Motif scaffolding. Structure first.
Motif, PDB file in Angstrom:
ATOM      1  N   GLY A 241     -13.035 -40.549   1.643  1.00 24.52           N
ATOM      2  CA  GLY A 241     -13.533 -39.371   2.334  1.00 24.52           C
ATOM      3  C   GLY A 241     -12.550 -38.220   2.363  1.00 24.52           C
ATOM      4  N   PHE A 242     -11.257 -38.511   2.247  1.00 19.38           N
ATOM      5  CA  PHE A 242     -10.250 -37.459   2.258  1.00 19.38           C
ATOM      6  C   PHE A 242     -10.318 -36.653   0.967  1.00 19.38           C
ATOM      7  N   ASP A 243     -10.336 -35.328   1.101  1.00 23.26           N
ATOM      8  CA  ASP A 243     -10.430 -34.450  -0.056  1.00 23.26           C
ATOM      9  C   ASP A 243      -9.078 -34.372  -0.756  1.00 23.26           C
ATOM     10  N   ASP A 244      -9.056 -34.739  -2.035  1.00 28.04           N
ATOM     11  CA  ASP A 244      -7.836 -34.702  -2.825  1.00 28.04           C
ATOM     12  C   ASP A 244      -8.202 -34.482  -4.285  1.00 28.04           C
ATOM     13  N   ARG A 245      -7.313 -33.803  -5.006  1.00 27.02           N
ATOM     14  CA  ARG A 245      -7.519 -33.492  -6.415  1.00 27.02           C
ATOM     15  C   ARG A 245      -6.969 -34.565  -7.345  1.00 27.02           C
TER      16      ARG A 245
ATOM     17  N   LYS B  91     -14.898 -25.059   2.988  1.00 29.49           N
ATOM     18  CA  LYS B  91     -15.189 -24.954   1.562  1.00 29.49           C
ATOM     19  C   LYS B  91     -14.884 -26.248   0.817  1.00 29.49           C
ATOM     20  N   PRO B  92     -15.708 -27.285   0.971  1.00 25.65           N
ATOM     21  CA  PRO B  92     -15.464 -28.529   0.234  1.00 25.65           C
ATOM     22  C   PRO B  92     -15.595 -28.318  -1.267  1.00 25.65           C
ATOM     23  N   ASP B  93     -14.811 -29.087  -2.024  1.00 26.37           N
ATOM     24  CA  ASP B  93     -14.780 -28.911  -3.473  1.00 26.37           C
ATOM     25  C   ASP B  93     -16.061 -29.419  -4.125  1.00 26.37           C
ATOM     26  N   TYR B  96     -23.260 -28.754  -4.759  1.00 26.44           N
ATOM     27  CA  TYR B  96     -24.576 -29.364  -4.618  1.00 26.44           C
ATOM     28  C   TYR B  96     -25.034 -30.049  -5.900  1.00 26.44           C
ATOM     29  N   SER B  97     -24.591 -29.562  -7.057  1.00 28.68           N
ATOM     30  CA  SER B  97     -24.994 -30.117  -8.341  1.00 28.68           C
ATOM     31  C   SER B  97     -24.069 -31.223  -8.832  1.00 28.68           C
ATOM     32  N   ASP B  98     -23.052 -31.593  -8.053  1.00 32.85           N
ATOM     33  CA  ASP B  98     -22.129 -32.641  -8.474  1.00 32.85           C
ATOM     34  C   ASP B  98     -22.733 -34.035  -8.386  1.00 32.85           C
ATOM     35  N   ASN B 153     -21.569 -27.467   1.378  1.00 28.11           N
ATOM     36  CA  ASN B 153     -21.376 -26.312   0.507  1.00 28.11           C
ATOM     37  C   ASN B 153     -22.554 -25.350   0.616  1.00 28.11           C
ATOM     38  N   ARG B 154     -23.779 -25.871   0.520  1.00 26.37           N
ATOM     39  CA  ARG B 154     -24.963 -25.029   0.644  1.00 26.37           C
ATOM     40  C   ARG B 154     -25.156 -24.511   2.064  1.00 26.37           C
TER      41      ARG B 154
END
Lengths: 363, 355, 202, 173, 364
Positions: A241-245, B91-93, B96-98, B153-154
């Protein structure tokens, strides 16, 4: 001459006038406190160690980005106004953290494992050393690797050589320290682990020897079975769940990972599963030469002779004989260890030191 | 440089005797205001100069002067918790289309969440009630958290992600305060979204016998259910419950009225897994003329987390096998590697149906 | 000036002017909750009778590389990590650990695994391994382990005694000494009753 | 919090204090080694003593609502606190027909829907599961573009997943 | 650019003498003649340029076309050597404020590659104009020591009271950082990205595309996306922000523009693009100008590649492990790496020849 009048002259004049204001701005006591919350009106609330409560205006020497809830700032004596933000030096919190800089290791001592090294090197060292391979191709490297195998294969030295070549932060989390006596501190510990590793560099996260929750064994620490999930799922939510690249690399290894919840392993994030077995007679000849490289050996001692005697032994059992043989000659204080010491050392390791069970055998 | 412009006001905004204000809360209002300090001390004062009589409300933090106590400026309530300030992301990476596939599980979430936020007047014509809660569990590894970040995001609004181990604190009874921290911002910040991750460690119905300490976890839900469905039917935003263990959940929690739309992720079929490799074909390197329908067909039914590992490993064969770009030959090796080679533990793939 | 000032120093802070006056004293040796600091004990080899046969086993193994670090470095081997004793409790096995620390001129420090777990902000799990730092600033440590298992005083004679968490954690910290500092001044002294009490990893 | 609640209840008139979700109070058992307790028990003792000696005469009345009675304090039920035992069995055929119809008062239909017919399609459903039927019926008209909710929307809403509903191209023949 | 032709003396030469810059905004061929003669000058081309500054009448007092003619003489006399002093004495005869911008540019192009104390102090005295700051970063390219130390001299340029000097600070940072991106350069461009003056922020955007030359995005992912809040504040922020974003992806991300190589040879074609497009990027930038000034960057694009042949061009496969490709063969690119075989002469990337010995010979 011309530029110094328009640069050095106005600069030195403003610096001297700024230092004169620092006496009226920064007082003698310079009280501090804990910042709670900030508002867009440039007004915040700070709590001193005596637990008071005040509402003042945000002054200069600070910005909106430097202010974070839960930090420490500088206050004023009479007006109690915020003078500025005080950064935290000498580590964020703990000084015993496993973070180090460029430890001492090489690839010559870990030799013989190259079959298992090629998998972990491409998924860890390669994106850190050569980021242009994964970025230009478009593939995403895995966020971590996991190790499994028989005990004694030397899985600790596999990830130790990575910290030296990457020349970055290297962290270690003991699997037995994951839980805590007080209920609720389990996830609080794991939350601070990824918090420190996420602020400075992708670094490395290495977890070794996980006994947590496995077959109980801790009756001095009681979680009531409810702390089991809250502590373990905290590690799962930080890997999913943690956002990471893809910067954070978390490595987990122990004797047996099958007893652990496979949901905690989080499949698909870890694309590397490495297995370790006992080396053959050809590999032990190279491993024995590593520990005996810095050791002084006699003329009658042959490396191929001791390898033939070794039967069903791991990498840790080979170093045990080299250490025991050095202690046998240490009692007699000999410069070069004779062949009679290796004969008595190899017999005591596989007998008293190493207890060989039957396990699965069926001859 | 910016400090010089603010030093001009230093003769006013600093040396003034107003700014040193003592923050406190008014316990009783008589229309005489009884105000309790942080030192465990109370007093009674009236209004101020610019203070309006309708601004002071019952149970609100009100700052007063330090020397002679008088009401000066009101402050928003619930100033103590610092924990929920970091729960709101931005702003999550994941877009919606992912989410790979045309599967209708996407259409069900956008109509119960994104539709009432974007078009609130669509359902107002029929005079219906939009679903307050939703249900997303599924097996682990299907990308459930990707759908949670796709809606944020949306939405283009405040999004809150709550960890299942975050609600339970280091004291007994503090977890009940943690619940009121989330629903208090719902009235403060309108049109937001709250999300719960791994609600199994939260959810109750653990019964009693033999542990003796299981009553601390169930009290969090009793506060969570009360703050959700109480006496006064107070609610605005949408609530999302997500966990990998549907069996250990409270059977009362699964009952409707706190949840309406129930969507459980399944294993993508040959047509479902086809779009998984097509959305990943735009990335990496794909040889011209390669049919991904044969790759997903050789791979049996498994979680979506193991499908993206195929494309990740497929690009890793060119390094050892001395290849320019990923070919069809390297794709067949990933079938025996990502799937057949990893079949020993380290995976779910419908491992846990219940526990 | 600020050159004579360092962390953990008791000083005198003036009242009216709110400024530093002078330095009073330093910080005491015991820190945190419970810290046992004993330097140069009174236990010697003459105080232990009948164990002379076992004294040579704790000398050429434990005491020898501490006094002569150049032996194992020249032989090409590694310095031993720790030595554990197997015997019934109350027989003086702890006295042997305090006697060897006197001849090596070290500071005897125990480990109580019961109080190593506390709850603070950032210090919660620090207290477990905090004893590692106390053996850093002072190299002559020779760490000793206390509160092994149940000898029949408390309950829970079976399962674990709580030492398996602390013992295996302190032994793992020794890899950072040779890996980073490239010198190991820390040695863990352990004891037990039976053979099967220890974990199979040890 | 309990003492200050009933202390004002005398001056605030018989406010009829309502307490919901009683599963948090009433557990006792015993304490040996781990599983720390008694911190919650002190709250129960105030609830028991305040409603016995110094109150519960005329103007003091308390209504309690819990979920399951399997776990509670057997001493909590007493002639001085909780008298009547009220059970809420699942609504009958004619009972569900009246409940389902009231939730549609704010909707727009052609009044061609038979609610007694929908009551038989609902087999042993609680009051919460009945409300979700009207919610799903409104979502079907949004996708189909219907200007009003017809009878097939409620029937299809039952086939949609609410409770004990799965479908999703699963046929056992 | 890079070509040499003697037929321009009868076409573009007489047009540049029409003095159409201040009136009709025409006769811009002076910029075209600069790309003709590279490293060398001309008597008739220079004379036609000085004739525009000879009249200096009221019509010619416009400051828009002043630096357009200076870029012509700056490219022609770039790398002239000790012969630049004779040209500066002729320009110093006519006294006009326009001559101050010519000497700080043409004078800095001949000494490019060598640092000097007197040359830097002379550029700082003219600030109390646009290319006077860029002259410091230009002459510091040849010295790797003065290149990294020039960052501290750029941050000290904010002490002036005028904002026209501060907006020119990030333009000099992109010249020294055009080779490889640095971490300290990114922290400096962050302060110039947020400012009350729009010209300071717009100039910092164009500097991000130059510093990130050679790759797509590394630390610039969050920096370019931070500018999304400026689209609603300014209408001109739509084109300017996305203009520098394409420079990172220029040539499908593989192509780039750099004046350095394995032989340490400064290319005048690349210097004829970045330096000309730095000042007057768009119409609102600096004074009133046109949108045709930034098209000079297309002439200086140098792609990275590695290739091997034999005699007539028969393709020969090598082994080079780089970013995607790993263990390439023929028709790929590489940087700062060679193969395991024996090359012929260059021993570097590009098109080379392989010559194998009879002892150890390994081929396809």
């Amino acid at each position: 001459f011309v530029s110094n009048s328009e640069i050095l002259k106005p600069f030195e004049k403003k610096q001297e006038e700024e230092k004169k204001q620092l006496e009226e701005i920064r007082g003698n006591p310079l009280s501090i406190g804990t910042l709670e919350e900030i508002i867009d009106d440039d007004h915040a609330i700070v709590t001193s160690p005596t637990m008071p409560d005040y509402y003042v205006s945000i002054l200069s020497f600070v910005d909106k980005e430097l202010l974070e809830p839960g930090c420490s700032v500088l206050l004023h004596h009479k007006t109690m106004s915020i003078v500025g933000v005080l950064q935290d030096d000498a580590d964020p919190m703990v000084s015993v953290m496993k973070m180090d800089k460029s430890p001492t290791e090489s690839y010559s001592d870990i030799g013989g494992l190259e079959s298992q090294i090629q998998e972990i090197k491409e998924s860890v060292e390669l994106p850190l050393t050569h980021p242009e391979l994964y970025e230009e191709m478009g593939i995403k490297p895995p966020k971590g690797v996991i190790l499994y195998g028989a005990p004694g294969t030397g899985k600790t030295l596999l990830a130790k050589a990575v910290a030296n070549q990457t020349s970055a932060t290297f962290l270690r989390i003991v699997g037995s320290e994951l839980i805590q006596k007080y209920l609720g501190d389990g996830p609080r510990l794991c939350r601070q682990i990824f918090k420190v590793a996420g602020e400075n560099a992708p670094s490395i996260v290495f977890i070794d020897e996980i006994d947590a929750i496995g077959t109980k064994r801790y009756d001095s620490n009681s979680g009531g079975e409810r702390e089991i999930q809250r502590t373990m799922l905290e590690l799962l939510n930080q890997l999913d769940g943690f956002d990471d690249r893809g910067d954070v690399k978390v490595i987990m290894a122990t004797n047996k990972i099958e007893t652990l919840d496979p949901a905690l392993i989080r499949p698909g994030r870890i694309d590397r599963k490495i297995l370790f077995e006992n080396p053959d007679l050809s590999t032990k000849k190279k491993i024995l030469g590593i520990h005996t490289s810095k050791m002084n050996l006699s003329e009658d001692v042959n490396l191929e002779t001791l390898v033939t005697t070794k039967d069903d032994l791991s990498g840790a059992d080979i170093q045990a004989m080299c250490t025991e043989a050095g202690l046998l000659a240490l009692r007699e204080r000999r410069m070069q260890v004779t062949a009679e010491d290796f004969k008595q050392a190899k017999e005591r390791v596989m007998k008293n030191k190493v207890e060989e069970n039957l396990e699965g055998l069926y001859l | 440089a910016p400090s010089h412009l603010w030093d001009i006001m230093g003769d006013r905004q600093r040396l003034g005797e107003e700014h040193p204000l003592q923050v406190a809360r008014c316990t009783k209002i008589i229309k005489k205001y009884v105000i309790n300090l942080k030192q465990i001390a109370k007093f009674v004062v009236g209004l101020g100069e610019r203070v309006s009589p309708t601004d002071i409300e019952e149970g609100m933090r009100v700052g007063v002067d330090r020397s002679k106590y008088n009401i000066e400026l009101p402050l928003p309530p619930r100033i103590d918790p610092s924990v929920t300030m970091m729960t709101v992301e931005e702003k999550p990476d994941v877009t919606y289309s992912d989410v790979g596939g045309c599967k209708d599980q996407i259409e069900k979430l956008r109509e119960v969440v994104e539709l009432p936020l974007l078009s609130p007047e669509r359902f107002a014509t029929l005079g219906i009630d939009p679903p307050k809660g939703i249900l997303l569990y599924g097996p682990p590894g299907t990308g459930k958290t990707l759908c949670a970040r796709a809606v944020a995001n949306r939405t283009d609004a405040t999004f809150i992600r709550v960890i299942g181990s975050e609600l339970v604190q280091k004291y007994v009874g503090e977890g009940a305060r943690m619940v009121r921290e989330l629903f208090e911002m719902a009235r403060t910040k309108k049109a937001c979204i709250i999300f719960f991750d791994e609600i199994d460690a939260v959810g109750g119905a653990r019964f009693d016998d033999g542990a003796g300490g299981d009553n601390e976890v169930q009290r969090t839900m009793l506060e969570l259910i009360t703050q959700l469905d109480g006496f006064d039917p107070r609610g605005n935003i949408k609530v999302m419950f997500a966990t990998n263990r549907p069996n250990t959940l409270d059977p009362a929690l699964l009952r409707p009225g706190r949840i309406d739309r129930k969507v459980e992720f399944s294993l993508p079929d040959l047509e479902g897994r086809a779009n998984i490799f097509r959305i990943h074909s735009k990335s990496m390197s794909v040889e011209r003329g390669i049919r991904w329908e044969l790759i997903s067909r050789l791979c049996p039914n498994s979680t979506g987390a193991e499908l993206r590992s195929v494309c990740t490993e497929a690009g890793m064969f060119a390094i050892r096998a001395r290849r320019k770009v990923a070919t069809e030959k390297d794709f067949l090796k990933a079938v025996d590697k990502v799937i057949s080679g990893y079949k020993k533990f380290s995976s779910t793939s419908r491992y846990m149906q219940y526990n | 000036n600020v050159k004579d000032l360092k962390a953990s120093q008791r000083v005198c802070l003036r009242s009216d002017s709110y400024m530093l006056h002078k330095v009073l004293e330093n910080k005491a040796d015991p820190l945190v909750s419970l810290m046992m600091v004993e330097k140069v004990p009174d236990s010697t080899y003459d105080m232990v009778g009948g164990l002379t046969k076992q004294i040579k086993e704790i000398k050429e193994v434990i005491e020898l590389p501490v006094k002569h670090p150049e032996l194992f470095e020249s032989l090409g081997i590694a310095q031993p990590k720790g030595v554990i004793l197997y015997g019934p409790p109350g027989t003086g096995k702890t006295l042997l650990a305090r006697a060897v620390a006197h001849h090596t001129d070290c500071k005897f420090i125990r480990v109580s695994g019961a109080e190593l777990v506390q709850k603070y902000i950032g210090e919660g799990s620090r207290m477990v391994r905090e004893l590692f730092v106390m053996a850093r600033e002072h190299a002559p440590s020779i760490i000793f382990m206390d509160e092994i298992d149940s000898i029949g005083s408390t309950r829970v004679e079976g399962s674990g005694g709580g030492d398996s968490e602390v013992q295996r954690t302190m032994l793992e910290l020794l890899n950072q000494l040779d890996g980073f500092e490239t010198s190991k001044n820390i040695k863990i002294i352990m004891a037990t009753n039976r053979l099967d009490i220890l974990d199979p990893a040890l | 919090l309990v003492r200050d609640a009933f202390a004002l209840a005398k001056e605030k008139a018989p406010t009829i204090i309502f307490i919901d979700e009683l599963d948090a109070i009433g557990t006792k058992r015993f304490d040996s080694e781990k599983s720390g307790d008694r911190e919650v028990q002190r709250t129960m003792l105030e609830l028991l003593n305040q409603l016995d000696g110094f109150s519960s005469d005329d103007r003091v009345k308390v209504l309690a609502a819990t979920n399951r009675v399997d776990v509670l304090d057997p001493a909590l039920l007493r002639s001085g606190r909780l008298d009547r035992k009220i059970e809420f069995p699942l609504p009958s055929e004619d009972s569900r027909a009246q409940i389902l119809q009231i939730h549609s008062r704010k909707m727009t239909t052609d009044d061609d829907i038979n609610w007694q017919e929908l009551a038989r399609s609902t087999d042993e459903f609680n009051g919460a599961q009945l409300k979700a039927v009207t919610v799903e019926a409104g979502m079907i008209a949004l996708r189909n573009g219907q200007s009003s909710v017809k009878h097939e929307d409620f029937v299809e809403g039952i086939s949609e997943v609410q409770a004990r509903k799965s479908k999703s191209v699963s046929f056992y023949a | 650019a890079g070509s040499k032709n003697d037929e321009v003396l009868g076409l573009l030469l007489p047009i540049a003498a029409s003095t159409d810059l201040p009136i009709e905004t025409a006769a811009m061929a002076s910029l075209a003649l600069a790309h003709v003669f590279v490293g060398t000058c001309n008597g008739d081309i220079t004379t036609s340029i000085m004739d525009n500054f000879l009249e200096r009448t009221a019509i010619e007092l416009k400051t828009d076309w002043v630096r357009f003619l200076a870029l012509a003489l700056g490219i022609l006399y770039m790398g002239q050597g000790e012969q630049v002093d004779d040209v500066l004495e002729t320009i110093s005869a006519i006294e006009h404020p326009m001559t101050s911008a010519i000497e700080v540019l043409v004078g800095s192009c001949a000494y490019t590659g060598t640092g000097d104390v007197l040359l830097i102090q002379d550029l700082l005295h003219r600030l109390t104009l646009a290319y006077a700051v860029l002259g410091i970063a230009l002459i510091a390219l040849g010295e790797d020591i003065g290149k990294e130390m020039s960052l501290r001299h750029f941050g000290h340029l904010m002490h002036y009271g005028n904002e026209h000097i501060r907006r020119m600070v990030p333009l000099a940072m992109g010249i020294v950082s055009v080779s490889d991106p640095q971490m300290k350069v990114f922290d400096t461009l962050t302060r110039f990205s947020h400012d009350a003056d729009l010209e300071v922020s717009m100039n910092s955007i164009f500097a991000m595309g130059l510093c990130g030359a050679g790759t797509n995005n590394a630390r610039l992912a969050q920096l370019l996306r931070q500018l999304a809040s400026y689209y609603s504040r300014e209408q001109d922020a739509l084109f300017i922000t996305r203009l520098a974003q394409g420079l990172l992806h220029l040539g499908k991300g593989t192509m780039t523009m750099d004046v350095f190589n394995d032989a340490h040879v400064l290319n005048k074609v690349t210097l004829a693009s970045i330096l000309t497009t730095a000042v007057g990027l768009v119409s609102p930038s600096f004074m009133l100008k046109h949108h045709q000034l930034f098209y000079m960057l297309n002439a200086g694009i140098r792609p990275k590649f590695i290739l091997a042949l034999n005699d007539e061009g028969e393709p020969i496969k090598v082994n080079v492990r780089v970013g995607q490709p790993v263990l390439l063969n023929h028709g790929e690119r590489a940087e700062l790496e060679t193969d395991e075989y024996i090359s012929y002469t260059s021993h570097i990337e590009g098109v080379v020849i392989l010559k194998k010995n009879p002892d150890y010979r390994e081929e396809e």
